[PDB]
Structures are given as structure tokens and as C-alpha cells.
């Protein structure tokens, strides 16, 4: 009964999107939509309409100490704006500058990202990744890494130093790299019928439309170093992060020390 209640409540025609991609004319899809999905209650169910309220973000820390595991996992983030905010483009450019690293990468010391270069040269981690997770009117913006138990402090220091460096003193060339990394990422991802079908379905629920690739290029080309400094400071500088730790995390910095890494006394 709990499951049928969940289905009749949420699997309603105004809340679904039939997406397709590949060799097919839109007519036969719309005909098949009328042929099979017509028998579905829609546009007025009852006085039982779901609505997503806002969700409070809390600066906080959760630390699962477990010294039996050989490598520690750390995820740190601030509050993101949400799906529809135009700031996500500039945030993804800033995250692309910091980028991501793995111990199987070939570049190592010559990588552009200062965090990746230092992480590979001094062997501060096995991997790290930035992320901008989007939800309705909220999100998690930050990074996740995994490293030896004696590298958690150095890794956190270099990570926060790059947030602060971009908040205050981002430069034009590296921002162009972040825009170029994003253009390549966007076109490489929409290669195949299944990625495009996902982009169609998810966008219609979040954006209410398909944002063409030419529009993403317009918003990416608008970003420059000033946009990154303003946009990064709006979400990173002097903000309470949410920290999650797991594994041998004795060397994980105290939250106050992490919170102090979100601003610079020189600025």
C-alpha cells in the first residue's frame, strides 16, 4: 500500500516527460504518446498536489573515524544556487580550472591545474574531483578527494587556497581554459542517443525547455575573470561548508580551521 500510494501520488502525467532521440520523426512519437499514455489521469488529480519546499543548508561536519580502511575519503562543499540559476555556468568554469586528478593520469607535474600539479608532484592524493550538484533552489558545490592518512591536511590546504585564489585573483587565460574544458565536456557528453535523450528528459523537468548548445556557448563566452571572481566569492568566500569524512581521518582539520580556510587575511 505504501508503494501504490507513492505511484498514484507522483506518477502523474503533468510530472512526466516522454523523451526520445535518434532516427525518428516527432509525429510518430506524439501519435504513440496519444495511443498509449492517453489513459492516465492528468491536469487535475485531487487536492493532493505535491510541492517542494526549500531545504535548509547547514554548515556542519560529520566524521566517521575508521582506521581499518587504508585511505580516507573527504567531501567538502558550500551551498549552490540550484538548477535554474545563471551562476551555474560560471561556477562550472571555476570548477573546470581546478579540474580533477587521478593517479593514472599521464600529465602529472605539468598539469595546468595547480591543485593537480601539486597533488601529483608531492603525491598528496590518489584522486580528487570537483562537483556542482544541482537541486531545486539548492545544491552542493565543492570537491571530493581520497588520500593517505598523512596527506589530509596538505590536500585541504591546497584545495581551499585555490578557492580563495579564484575568489580574489583569477586571471584571464586560465578562465579561458575553464571555458574550453566546458565546451569540450558539453559536446563530448551529448554524443549518442542515450545522453541526448537524458538531456531532453531532465531539462524539461528542470528548465521547462531544451537549452540549445548555441545558448550554452553564449553563456560560456560571457564568462571572464571578473565573472569568476565575483561568482566564486558569492558562494565560497567566508561561507560555512558542509564537511563529510570517512576512514583514517585523525589528520582531518578541525571545522574551525576549515572555516578559517574560507577567507584570506591578506585580502
Amino acid at each position: 500500500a505504501d508503494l501504490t500510494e507513492y505511484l498514484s501520488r507522483h506518477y502523474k502525467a503533468p510530472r512526466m516527460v516522454l523523451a526520445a532521440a535518434g532516427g525518428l520523426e516527432h509525429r510518430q512519437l506524439l501519435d504513440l504518446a496519444q495511443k498509449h499514455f492517453s489513459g492516465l489521469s492528468g491536469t487535475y488529480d485531487e487536492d493532493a498536489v505535491p510541492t517542494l519546499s526549500p531545504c535548509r543548508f547547514t554548515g556542519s561536519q560529520i566524521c566517521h573515524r575508521e582506521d581499518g580502511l587504508p585511505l580516507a575519503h573527504v567531501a567538502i562543499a558550500v551551498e549552490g544556487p540550484g538548477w535554474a540559476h545563471p551562476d551555474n555556468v560560471a561556477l562550472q568554469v571555476a570548477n573546470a580550472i581546478i579540474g580533477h586528478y587521478d593517479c593514472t593520469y599521464g600529465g602529472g607535474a605539468h598539469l595546468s591545474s595547480p591543485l593537480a600539479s601539486i597533488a601529483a608532484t608531492n603525491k598528496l592524493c590518489q584522486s580528487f574531483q570537483t562537483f556542482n550538484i544541482c537541486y531545486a533552489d539548492t545544491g552542493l558545490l565543492g570537491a571530493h578527494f581520497v588520500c593517505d592518512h598523512m596527506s589530509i591536511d596538505d590536500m585541504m590546504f591546497v584545495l581551499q587556497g585555490q578557492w580563495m585564489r579564484l575568489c580574489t585573483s583569477a586571471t584571464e587565460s586560465e578562465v579561458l581554459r575553464g571555458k574550453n574544458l566546458l565546451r569540450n565536456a558539453l559536446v563530448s557528453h551529448l554524443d549518442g542517443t542515450t545522453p541526448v535523450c537524458e538531456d531532453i528528459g531532465r531539462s524539461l523537468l528542470t528548465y521547462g525547455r531544451r537549452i540549445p548548445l548555441a545558448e550554452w556557448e553564449s553563456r560560456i563566452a560571457e564568462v571572464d575573470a571578473r565573472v569568476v571572481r565575483e561568482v566564486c566569492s558569492k558562494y565560497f568566500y567566508d561561507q560555512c561548508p558542509a564537511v563529510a569524512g570517512f576512514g583514517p581521518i585523525e589528520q582531518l582539520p578541525d571545522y574551525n580551521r576549515i572555516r578559517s580556510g574560507m577567507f584570506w587575511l591578506r585580502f
Binding site: 547547514t58 554548515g59 556542519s60 561536519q61 560529520i62 566524521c63 566517521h64 573515524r65 575508521e66 582506521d67 581499518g68 592518512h149 598523512m150 589530509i152 591536511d153 560555512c240 583514517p248 585523525e250 589528520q251 571545522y255 574551525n256 572555516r259
Partner: protein, 75 residues
């Protein structure tokens, strides 16, 4: 010296922490504080009070016996 990451071995212990900019620095300061100070004193008053009371008795007697020893008598 001793460093973090080389101190000791701990397993299966979770710790939840709140940011200081989202909580009060004086949460229930008088509500819970004053009952806890009475508890802390009651739990230690019988350990600390007697010797200082014993001093206060010796201090009072010895000061009384001192003055009355030099005062003259009819002899």
C-alpha cells in the same frame, strides 16, 4: 613531539559537529548552567570544605588565646 595522524588507533566512532555561525554561544546559560554548578559543588564540597574549616577554627582559637595571654591578671 607528536603529530595528528600518528597519535593512536580509533575505529567505528562517528562525530557530528555544527558550525559556530549557526548555533548559540550561550545556549541555556542560566537554565542548565546554574543547576550544573550546584551539582559540581555538592559533589566536591565534602572533599574541600573540612580542612579549610579546620584552619578557620585553629585561626580563630590561636588568635583569641594569643591576645588573652598577654593581658594582665590580678596576680
Amino acid at each position: 613531539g607528536r603529530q595528528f595522524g600518528h597519535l593512536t588507533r580509533v575505529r567505528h566512532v562517528i562525530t557530528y559537529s555544527l558550525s559556530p555561525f549557526e548555533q548559540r554561544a550561550f545556549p541555556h546559560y542560566f537554565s542548565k548552567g546554574i543547576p550544573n554548578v550546584l551539582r559540581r559543588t555538592r559533589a566536591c564540597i565534602l572533599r574541600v570544605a573540612p580542612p579549610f574549616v579546620a584552619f578557620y577554627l585553629v585561626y580563630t582559637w590561636g588568635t583569641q588565646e594569643f591576645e588573652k595571654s598577654k593581658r594582665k591578671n590580678p596576680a
